[PDB]
Design a protein around this nucleic acid. Structure first.
Ligand SMILES: [Mg+2]
Ligand SMILES: [Mg+2]
Ligand SMILES: [Mg+2]
Ligand SMILES: [Mg+2]
Lengths: 58, 852
RNA sequence: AUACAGUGAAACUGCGAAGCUCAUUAAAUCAGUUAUCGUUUAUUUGAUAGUUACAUGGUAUAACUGUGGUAA
RNA sequence: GAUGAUUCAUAAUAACUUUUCGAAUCGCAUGGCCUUGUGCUGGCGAUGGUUCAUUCAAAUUUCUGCCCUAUCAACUUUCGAUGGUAGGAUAGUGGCCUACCAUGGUUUCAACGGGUAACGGAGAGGGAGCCUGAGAAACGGCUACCACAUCCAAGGAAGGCAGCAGGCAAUUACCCAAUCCUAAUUCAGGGAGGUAGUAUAAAUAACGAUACAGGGCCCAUUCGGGUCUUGUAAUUGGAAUGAGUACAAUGUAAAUACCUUAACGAGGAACAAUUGGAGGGCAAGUCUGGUGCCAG
């Protein structure tokens, strides 16, 4: 039954309607703003023990 | 009624439109309840999607059972008890009861390799392995969904800490699990990965943050439909080419048909492709083409007949495309051997003229004298000497897989090609047949497992010149930084992994996890002299084995699961039963890899010398923060060594490798009688003692091995060339030279011992031969004892022989080879060999007289 | 209730488990009647056994505790 | 000693035995004694146990008992038919079975065979073997064999539904109370059983008042003849009550139903039964045929 709600999932137009310590970790994760890929950008890695931090591969 | 985030529906629909796969990571205890919703969205987007589902788990399912009758009985009892109404079924129970789900353990991931599934569910995150992740994802078709259920609380705490701070790694109270942590970070880079909770809230850590629904709707299909239409009238080409699924597959089949048409029996076709690209379908279709063309004696060879089930399946589909009918035009013969599991062995065809397709073991090359075609499937897994015998005066098709199953190193395929440079035709299949080309998941998987890594020639080394080995220095590689998924570390990892795969014969996907998580393992890299990312020249992976590992082992047994093993310490235990060697600490060189182009320039020896120096002490906290990264590479002095007694190696005996370890002062102590089935060479263990430590034990072991080797030349090492056998003896004797002490010394044969071994009539027979008064056959009985006495060093300084003469005596006496067999091996005519053999026996007789 | 003592899951013992559908068969079915000095018989009922001990063993395990195998 | 009758009941001798049985059990109560030790001796029950009799059953067994038949005169020894001796088995008698022996047994007084309104004994997927019990060749279980069919990760596992009830479509819901039956039993149970579910007598009306009209009806082919309180397509009054709408009690294991019984309940009594038959008559209407205005 596509138009109807089968199981708990209903699709109208292009939007789907569904019926539904860790909890603190859940909400903290949901509120994160920067992506993991972006967080890598500000990071630099030291190649040798006293070498200069290299950020991006050439 | 909660409005789902628009990203989740859009991603599934985008994948279906573009035939790209997508990854969902569901975090929460109620993650299982969200799978039915995702599957429904997948099916509604396209009704042509495959409805089969794959459920992979380690030991236990999540709160349900896959046995139907057990489920209804629990349901019926619940209904009878009144806990549930008569007809209530929550969505999850409906999802399992109706849908076609295949439940598979992680251990038995081989069974799923052939099949194709619409959705893949990986129940357990902690137990994910590189092999299980390559095998399972490859079965998902275009538009499918890969679901990974990160339900564990500890897994979530790792997820939280990295997202809060990429440097920080959550580490519980000896396995580090670096592969899983690197896996999580990689998921962020994937554009088709969404990480969601059990409420379908999109966690922003995922890479698919900015997914937007695509507008409603490929060139490769266009280049494929036109080709089929053009060839429809031209049978048998049209019917068979119709079975092709991709442009590359059709081109390969047509090229095979060209070979089948040319009828040249000195012609060879080499097919190279990745796994899942459709080689076996191409092979089976072409075999059907040769059947319809007229080839009668068609052969198929592989390591085992079971692996050919797909190839034979597509032959029959090709036969169906050609109108052949089972039990009228052809008959199927299945194996009676229980080992082959009723695998098809022979197909007999009766149309027009009698035509036969037969499976042969690769060793049986003699039967191929009447062959018109042999199809070598998975030639990578057949030993190189054996396949060379298989290249006869007949049409040859070879299929070799690159980075599929174990496959083989890419350079090995190149070395095989270089040898073939017989007329050659090379064909390559690049496009996948289950999903769209350039699928992000396949790219993400290859990066994560470093499967597609390739070696690159460095122009800078050419300009500056090749570094002299004395200039190069050895540096330790910190594993936490290497597997931190930083772009710099990732590039260095790829270069290291490139060196690994090219050199060694066989590499499994799990080797990456073993290297990352195992505590005993360490990594060393021989960088060029520092003066950009450095390009390693040689990489050494060692594993600490001995008394040091016992503390880690004892922890594992307390866990209830023994972790890993001590190969050399256990091996030396059963062979010699020496309690001391168990207590001795040592390191085993798991793998030493060098650039094949720069081989013979002395890097491999240089790195071992520096490594030997390091553990001798001649060069005398970097862990990640546990809830800013340390340097990627560490100088040798910066990290103190463990106390070790010996350096060991385990490798498949080849003349090149044996010469390499012989030159580096390694002494052989064991050699396996049973050849490795995949590669065909014998595993050899060689040990090296470090200065300042007792060396008495190694000398005793080497002496015992030499006696074992001498007697076992006749049993299973008779295949070895005589020159190779002498080298092993010579390498062992170098061990005796290492010990300056004369406490142990060979004993010259006494007259009393001489009488027992040879009777006087024999000695008279030996004298008469030297006088040329006897034939060679008369003395055949005495030769093996003479070889034992001579190579036992009982004859002493009186009798010495040349390297060629020692080879001849060893071959007759020990290898049991014929005198003519030595002639071919030593490139000497038979008459000269017998003349030399007589001269050898004169010296032995003269010595026998002198004692008397 | 200083062995337990009310009630009592599970488990071990004891007792009882003894309408339909097809075919057809003339005093071989069935009915009445006779015999068992020619027999078996739970139960009911009535009779009926003077020929370490202030109480023996596990030669004993279940339910139960806990460790696991299996798709079941 | 007992029967009509016994090698019957019973007793004894000598041995035999996978020699049986002859309370290592439980509940309630705590009396009578004294030799004060918790010393001796104790009341009512339950569960067990040998043998006999009784009861409930079972198995064989004597004699008798309505069809047509000779166009059914032999049948039986056809792997026992009739009988004797011995053994095996059975709970026992017994050709029930086995060894030896005799040649018998039914029949024209109807054997044997045939037909039958002789509904006027068998099985639980199909044959074979076995197990429990006082009682079964068990609608139970087990083994192999033969088919059917189901789940599976294809390594195995399990079934008797090859059923039942329907059609050519609601067999369900409530109980053990009533009558009986089984148990470690007053109390548990029983799809035994019980309860419910889904051609026969009435009504659609009865009784009055007033007004206004002169015709109404019967017979007869024909002409005509016979007789008298009739018609309304008029107005009007107050009474009666059933269907319904329904408060209760009774009824019952409970409930439905039945019986009994408050209040309301009629003029279009619209609180609105039918079915069939025989005749008409009408237009600025339609069609057809003609010897105007007609006929169909
Ligand atoms: Mg009694
Ligand atoms: Mg007798
Ligand atoms: Mg009136
Ligand atoms: Mg009516």
């Amino acid at each position: 039954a596509p138009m109807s709600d089968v199981g708990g999932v209903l699709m109208d137009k292009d939007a789907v309607y569904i019926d539904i310590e860790g909890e603190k970790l859940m909400t903290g994760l949901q509120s994160v703003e920067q992506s993991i890929a972006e967080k890598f950008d500000g990071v630099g890695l030291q190649l040798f023990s006293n070498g200069t931090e290299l950020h991006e591969v050439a | 009624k909660k409005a789902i985030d628009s990203r989740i529906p859009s991603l599934i629909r985008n994948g279906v439109q573009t035939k790209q796969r997508s990854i969902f990571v569901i975090v929460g205890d109620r993650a299982r309840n969200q799978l039915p919703n995702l599957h429904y969205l997948m099916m509604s987007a396209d009704l042509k999607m495959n409805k089969s589902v794959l459920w992979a788990y380690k030991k236990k399912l999540l709160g349900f059972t896959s046995h139907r009758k057990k489920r209804e009985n629990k349901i019926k009892k619940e209904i009878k008890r009144g806990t549930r109404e008569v007809n209530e079924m929550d969505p999850f129970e409906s999802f399992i009861s109706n849908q076609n789900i295949r439940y598979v353990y992680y251990k038995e991931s081989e069974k799923i390799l052939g099949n194709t599934y619409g959705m893949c569910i990986l129940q357990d995150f902690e137990a994910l392995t590189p092999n299980l992740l390559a095998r399972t994802i490859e079965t998902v078709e275009g538009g499918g969904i890969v679901v990974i259920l990160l339900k564990s609380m500890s897994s979530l705490k790792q997820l939280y800490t990295m997202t809060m701070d990429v440097h920080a790694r959550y580490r519980t109270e000896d396995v580090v699990a670096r592969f899983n942590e690197r896996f999580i970070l990689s998921l962020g880079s994937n554009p088709n990965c969404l990480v969601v909770d059990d409420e379908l809230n999109v966690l922003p850590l995922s890479g698919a943050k900015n997914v937007k629904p695509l507008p409603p709707k490929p060139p490769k299909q266009l280049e494929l439909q036109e080709l089929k239409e053009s060839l429809e009238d031209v049978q048998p080409a049209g019917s068979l080419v119709s079975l092709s699924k991709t442009v590359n597959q059709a081109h390969a089949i047509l090229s095979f048909i060209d070979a089948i048409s040319e009828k040249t029996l000195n012609f060879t076709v080499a097919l190279t492709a990745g796994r899942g690209r459709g080689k076996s379908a191409a092979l089976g279709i072409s075999i059907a083409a040769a059947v319809s063309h007229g080839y009668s004696n068609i052969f198929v060879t592989s390591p085992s007949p079971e692996n050919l089930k797909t190839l034979f399946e597509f032959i029959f589909k090709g036969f169906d495309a050609l109108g052949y009918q089972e039990h009228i035009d052809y008959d199927i013969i299945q194996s009676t051997n229980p080992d082959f599991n009723k695998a098809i062995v022979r197909v007999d065809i009766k149309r027009d003229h009698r035509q036969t397709i037969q499976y042969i073991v690769p060793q049986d090359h003699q039967v191929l004298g009447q062959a018109e075609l042999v199809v070598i499937d998975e030639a990578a897994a057949i030993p190189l000497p054996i396949v060379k015998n298989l290249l006869g005066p007949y049409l040859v098709f070879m299929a070799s897989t690159i980075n599929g199953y174990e496959g083989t190193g890419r350079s090995l395929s190149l070395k095989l090609i270089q040898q073939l440079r017989r007329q050659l035709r090379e064909i390559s299949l690049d496009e996948p047949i289950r999903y769209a080309p350039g699928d992000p998941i396949e790219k993400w998987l290859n990066k994560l497992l470093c499967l597609d890594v390739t070696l690159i020639k460095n122009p800078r080394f050419a300009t500056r010149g090749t570094p002299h080995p004395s200039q190069c220095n050895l540096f330790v590689v910190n594993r936490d930084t290497l597997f931190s998924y930083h772009p710099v570390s990732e590039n260095f990892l790829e270069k290291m992994m490139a060196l690994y795969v090219s050199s060694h014969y066989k590499n499994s996907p799990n080797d990456l996890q073993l290297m990352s998580d195992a505590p005993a393992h360490k990594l060393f890299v021989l960088l060029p002299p520092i003066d950009r990312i450095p390009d390693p020249l040689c990489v050494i992976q060692i594993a600490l084995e001995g008394e040091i590992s016992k503390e880690s082992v004892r922890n594992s047994l307390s866990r209830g699961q023994r972790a890993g093993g001590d190969l050399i310490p256990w091996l030396i235990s059963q062979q010699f039963q020496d309690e001391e060697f168990a207590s001795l600490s040592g390191a085993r060189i798991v793998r030493i890899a060098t650039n094949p182009e720069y081989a013979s320039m002395g890097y491999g020896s240089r790195a071992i010398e520096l490594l030997r120096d390091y553990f001798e002490g001649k060069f005398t906290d970097y862990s990640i923060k546990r809830v800013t990264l340390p340097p990627l590479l560490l100088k040798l002095s910066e990290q103190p060594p463990h106390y070790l007694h010996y350096l060991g190696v385990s490798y498949g005996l080849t003349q090149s490798l044996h010469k390499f370890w012989k030159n580096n002062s390694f002494v052989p102590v064991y050699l396996r009688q049973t050849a490795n089935d995949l590669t065909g060479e014998h595993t050899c263990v060689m040990l090296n003692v470090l200065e300042g430590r007792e060396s008495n034990w190694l000398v005793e072991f080497a002496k015992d091995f030499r006696k074992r080797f001498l007697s076992l030349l006749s049993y299973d090492f008779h295949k070895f060339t005589a020159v190779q056998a002498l080298s092993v003896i010579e390498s062992s004797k170098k061990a005796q030279d290492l010990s300056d002490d004369e406490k142990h010394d060979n004993k010259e044969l006494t007259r009393t011992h001489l009488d027992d071994i040879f009777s006087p009539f024999d000695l008279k027979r030996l004298d008469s031969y030297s006088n040329n008064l006897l034939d060679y056959h008369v003395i055949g009985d005495m030769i093996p004892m003479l070889a034992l006495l001579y190579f036992g060093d009982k004859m002493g300084d009186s009798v010495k022989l040349s390297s060629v003469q020692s080879a001849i005596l060893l071959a007759i006496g020990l290898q049991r080879k014929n005198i003519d067999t030595i002639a071919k091996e030593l490139n000497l005519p038979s008459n000269q060999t017998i003349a030399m053999f007589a001269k050898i026996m004169r010296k032995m007789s003269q010595y026998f007289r002198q004692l008397l």
